[PDB]
Design a protein around this ligand. Structure first.
Ligand SMILES: *Cc1c(COP(=O)(O)O)cnc(C)c1O
Ligand SMILES: *Cc1c(COP(=O)(O)O)cnc(C)c1O
Lengths: 494, 494
């Protein structure tokens, strides 16, 4: 309990030091990013918060708040919240303190999230449609059954428990220059600032928020918790509409700066974490790095010791896909080509023969009658632009190609999933499916072996890292006759 | 050195106990899988080997072998290998012992893998084309410069160092029933068996190999290290042609059984690790779980305490994509529909209006003239088959749909990347790109807002979890005129 007002600097310190976090939570490693740090020119360190048993930090504050309630036998009474990632923190906590918790969530949440909570401990009650709706209940039941509302953020105790991290940080590397903090409701940044600010003033504390969830920046600018019209939903755990409150706006008087960023950045930040530390972030968990990356360049900060927080790690395996897909876009990984090859009766072979070694990502074609049936080709590069530059020229010895891959947002994002369709007039073709161990030039072989005496009307191929069914081809190494195939009919045939 | 023969049971034990592994390596957590264990009905535990500083286990054996060489001042002399995941182990080791190491790799390896090694420590020499070619050199240089060849597996010392794990295992949970071990060259299984077999005989030790890299099963069957014609390349670290040797075939006289499995399984096993432990495997690192899963059912093993090894974790972020993509196939996640909607002048709206709440993954269409332009629709499900069963019937109140999603390997794997093409005859259309915050029914809104008075000729949409550019539409919320767009021309236009 002991905080529900306007704690003063020190009071927070005290609360921080006195908070029983470790009974449930753990000090989290603070490791350095070797690739990135070396890339940019500073020491970059990450606060491995995903290593708590609830994979995020929330555990701290719920534990602190909840564990210092019981001084009032009001556990006997009870507790309740409404959520997805913090409902976890409470769950985990309720169980440890043997205090019954109730978690209210929307009605159509997701088995997965409902079981985690149920898992940790906690009883859920699925009641809502909207979130606000779930929370109206929670809050109801409070009042009626007397459960104790447990804030995801707006709370001195909750805040004090998060500072806990700061406390660790400073003891893990006191030669820190700047620290980057994610901003959802503001718990975490709030608890991190006060601390550091008390202990080591010279430490810079930058909040970092979602371009699309910029609760803070916005309230800042009005100097007023302000409701947001819309809130992005990538960075789930950061999707807050109106920042914290008092405690938050209040406390953000220790904040040194603020910075927003876009989903696309987050998606990179995720790539980064993974690649160096082999850590798996969750949008908001990567959010703060991204910011850094941003700040680094902005201010041309070279030479410092900076650290950010791997806030959490609750993400769907399949969510991973999207990410990649997005970074790929931002990267210069492949070549995307509109290569027109003259033939119909002859082959693609010749054309291939000069990409025999190079890695084929896509090679999609559909009969079309224009003396020159065009081909959507994709080639996995290494040397980026320079290597493409080759392919290109090289290919300049015959058919004429077009470099649809550079900035062709259209190809890169839609058309490379659209090449096909229908021919023109009915066709006496046959459909077949082929599969073959992927290698660096397996295709060729396939093609070579396939022969050159075919009136191939259709070709489809996506490859290393995205599909195991290898090829679908239509004429006029493993085979399956897929002729009158339903899909084909309805969309390709015609 | 002390092992280059036919170590006898105990000798291994000794070597195991005497091996200096911890100077470089760490005891690895052995945690239980709560979801899965509860799913299947046994206690399933994973040997978190990805937690070594080289993210795999290799560190053990290279360290053991290498650290007990120096008793011969032949470090002064030197060491060399040829690789990707084990070249790492040696690197890391060479540096710690301050013994110069040289790593030979093919000529066109991959910056990434070359830098890791360089990272850890070690000097690489990129010389090859083929792998065998890189190793011919390594072996050369030995002979000439006197470097000491360090086996990835064929070696009593190397083997003894891997047993180290076993040693841990048994001390981490002695109530184990069965243990599953991945099989590349056979180091790890070899070192794991001997141990356990010495210490606790009643422990079952199943190797688990790649359907496509079944080195062992094969040699077993002939009773003869046998060269494999082909070797899969998913499970990189398990891609061995002819099992170990003596040490391996020899030692596999302590093995209780063996079992293979397919890439597709591995891809699930990867999903699993991630979802419960939030660990990120690498094909071979998941290989062994998959096996389990297999064995579990085979033998209807209920009630046991079984554990497997998270062998390693070196994987490309982008590699992740493929995986998902594969599990999705094996799952029953979405609905794939050939829904024919009658209109041309009117709309898709009406059709939509009854999926307004349900989640849209794809909604792709191209003008075609048939009184009824057909639509490739995709819908994210929850209740699996049952829920689809609905959509279906529900949709039975109007246009007639076809359920191309069930077992339609064709749609699920090729066509859902092929719907489009060209129309029939030239078209006086205009292309536009739209983007809009994704939600549960944002589309609708888009559509509704888009209006109903449009002679829309083209539509393309892939969604939550795979693309941020939302829509591409062609007529006769953010907009961009993308009309004479190059890609479009060449492949859609026509
Ligand atoms: C909950 C959470 C946040 C931010 O929380 P606040 O205390 O409201 O700022 C950020 N990242 C992750 C992963 C989170 O779970
Ligand atoms: C090297 C390795 C293996 C198997 O090695 P062996 O000792 O040859 O059996 C398996 N999984 C991973 C991740 C590996 O790196």
């Amino acid at each position: 309990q002991p905080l529900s007002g306007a704690p003063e600097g020190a009071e927070y310190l005290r609360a921080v030091l006195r908070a029983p976090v470790y009974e449930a939570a753990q000090v989290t490693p603070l490791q350095k990013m070797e690739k990135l740090s070396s890339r940019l020119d500073n020491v970059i360190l990450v606060k491995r918060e995903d290593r708590q048993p609830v994979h995020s930090f929330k555990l701290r504050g719920a534990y602190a708040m909840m564990a210092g309630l019981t001084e009032e036998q009001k556990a006997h009474g009870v507790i309740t919240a409404s959520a997805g990632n913090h409902a976890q923190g409470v769950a985990f906590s309720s169980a440890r303190l043997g205090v019954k918790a109730l978690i209210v969530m929307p009605t159509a949440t997701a088995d997965i999230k409902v079981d985690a909570v149920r898992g940790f401990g906690g009883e859920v009650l699925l009641h809502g449609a909207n979130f606000d709706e779930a929370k109206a209940k929670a809050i109801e039941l409070s009042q009626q059954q007397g459960f104790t509302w447990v804030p995801p953020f707006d709370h001195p105790m909750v805040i004090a428990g998060q500072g806990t991290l700061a406390l660790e940080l400073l003891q893990q590397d006191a030669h820190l220059d700047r620290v980057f903090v994610p901003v959802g409701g503001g718990g975490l940044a709030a608890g991190v600032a006060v601390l550091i600010k008390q202990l080591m003033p010279q430490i810079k504390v930058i909040a970092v928020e979602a371009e699309d969830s910029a609760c803070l920046k916005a309230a800042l600018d009005a100097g007023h918790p302000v409701d947001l019209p819309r809130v992005g939903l990538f960075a789930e755990g950061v999707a807050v509409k109106r920042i914290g409150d008092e405690t938050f706006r209040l406390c953000q008087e220790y904040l040194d700066d603020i910075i927003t960023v876009d989903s696309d950045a987050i998606c990179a930040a995720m790539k980064d974490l993974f690649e160096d530390v082999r850590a798996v972030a969750e949008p908001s968990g990567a959010l703060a790095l991204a910011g850094m990356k941003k700040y680094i360049a902005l201010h041309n900060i070279r030479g410092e010791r900076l650290a950010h927080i791997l806030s959490g790690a609750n993400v769907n395996f399949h969510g991973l896909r999207y990410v990649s897909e997005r970074c790929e876009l931002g990267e210069q990984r492949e070549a995307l080509l509109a290569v027109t090859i003259p033939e119909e009766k002859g082959s693609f072979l010749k054309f291939c023969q000069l990409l025999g070694g190079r890695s084929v990502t896509e090679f999609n074609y559909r009969f079309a009658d224009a003396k020159n049936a065009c081909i959507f080709v994709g080639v996995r590069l290494s040397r980026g632009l320079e290597e493409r530059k080759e392919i290109l020229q090289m290919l300049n010895d015959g058919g004429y190609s077009v470099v649809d891959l550079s900035d062709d947002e259209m190809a890169k994002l839609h058309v490379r999933y659209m090449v096909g369709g229908r021919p023109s007039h009915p066709l006496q073709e046959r459909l077949y499916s082929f599969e073959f161990p992927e290698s660096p030039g397996a295709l060729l072989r396939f093609l070579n072996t396939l022969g050159t005496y075919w009136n191939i009307s259709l070709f489809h191929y996506r490859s290393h890292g995205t599909d195991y069914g290898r090829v679908l081809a239509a004429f006029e190494y493993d085979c399956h006759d897929e002729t009158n195939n339903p899909a084909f009919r309805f969309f390709l045939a015609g």
